[PDB]
DNA sequence: CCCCCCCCCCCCCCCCCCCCC
């Protein structure tokens with residue numbers, strides 16, 4: 023019922039099999055277009071089929087409290103050929119947002135979301151933002167024992183893998199670059215189960231030069247085939263546009 | 266792996282005549 027190529031032919035030019043459970047990951051520093059990419063994916067997924075959409079529902083989980091409905095509405099109205107309030111209402115009728123305040127809160131939200139997931143059959147995409155939102159607090163609360171710094175993340179990863187395997191969903195996660203290492207910059211620090219659960223990896227970067235910005239770099243790295251690709255794209259009032 | 270800063274030195278080098286009872 024779900025096809026990965028249709029979601030994004032630009033980035034997913036190799037994956038053509040009907041997706042029946044995948045885990046992806048975004049990574050990079052601040053202000054490099056991760057949330058804009060998520061907005062573009064949601065816009066591609068929730069638009070009507072007449073305007074070039076997918077007509078399936080999206081679930082969103084916000085952890086860093088950085089979601090902006092105004093930007094999403096602006097992108098939707100710019101992508102639409104004709105702007106009308108009722109069509110925007112129809113589009114937004116298939117969008118859901120959840121807030122979590124702590125690791126246990128997120129764990130219980132995951133333990134509760136399966137009721138909706140069995141209730142709603144049209145869900146095809148799942149987004150978790152800022153998976154590394156609670157790292158320092160958990161680490162400090164865990165003392166010097168590593169196993170006490172990893173339990174909540176372990177349980178959340180197990181629940182996420184169970185959900186994605188059971189309900190045939192697509193997961194999009196975001197992490198933050200917090201620590202360096204004594205061309206890809208990546209110093210893994212997450213849970214071992216989460217690290218081994220990843221399938222695709224994408225890194226984000228921004229041009230240092232001030233050519234009015236308008237240039238972002240993305241490096242796609244799939245662990246299945248060890249294929250490294252570089253993408254260039256721009257972000258405008260209508261969303262993101264690939265160079 | 267984790268976060269932010271310091272401070273001056275030292276002297277050189279001469280030119281140029283005027284005016285008769």
Ligand SMILES: Nc1ncnc2c1ncn2[C@@H]1O[C@H](COP(=O)(O)OP(=O)(O)OP(=O)(O)O)[C@@H](O)[C@H]1O
Nearest residue numbers: 051052053054055056057058059088235257258259
């Ligand atoms: N209307 C717009 N036109 C052009 N660029 C825009 C517009 N709106 C936002 N941007 C760009 O969006 C960029 C930030 O993107 P975004 O909010 O997705 O960051 P991010 O990589 O997800 O970072 P973080 O998660 O730390 O917030 C800015 O650098 C800005 O130039």
Ligand SMILES: [Mg+2]
Nearest residue numbers: 053056057088
């Ligand atoms: Mg962001």
